[PDB]
């Protein structure tokens with residue numbers, strides 16, 4: 001009956017959500033290593049988008065294309081929030097290293113511009129328009 005069928009479904013899929021998060025952990029780790037490699041070398045200058053940010057955004061795009069049909073929408077949103085958190089951590093580290101501060105000066109302006117390219121790229125991907133990226137965190 002419908003009840004027994006669904007009990008079988010429940011048993012078969014009981015770990016589905018937890019296991020997707022575990023595979024997604026490996027994907028976050030891959031992107032985290034890319035961000036560390038790229039952002040450790042980032043220099044603030046025109047033109048924008050900088051080569052660093054073009055590369056980050058291209059890989060984010062390719063990642064989205066690769067997993068779109070493999071993850072439910074909510075998990076894809078959650079994945080991108082984790083990827084974003086990694087990006088912000090590495091960007092914050094580099095801005096601190098370079099002594100770039102949020103004072104409205106030309107250097108701050110260039111980072112704001114590069115980040116606008118990043119945010120625009122991310123939010124233009126299917127399902128990601130209303131992600132709360134909290135990019136202001138990078139100046140903490």
Ligand SMILES: [Mg+2]
Pocket residue numbers: 105106107108
């Ligand atoms: Mg300046």
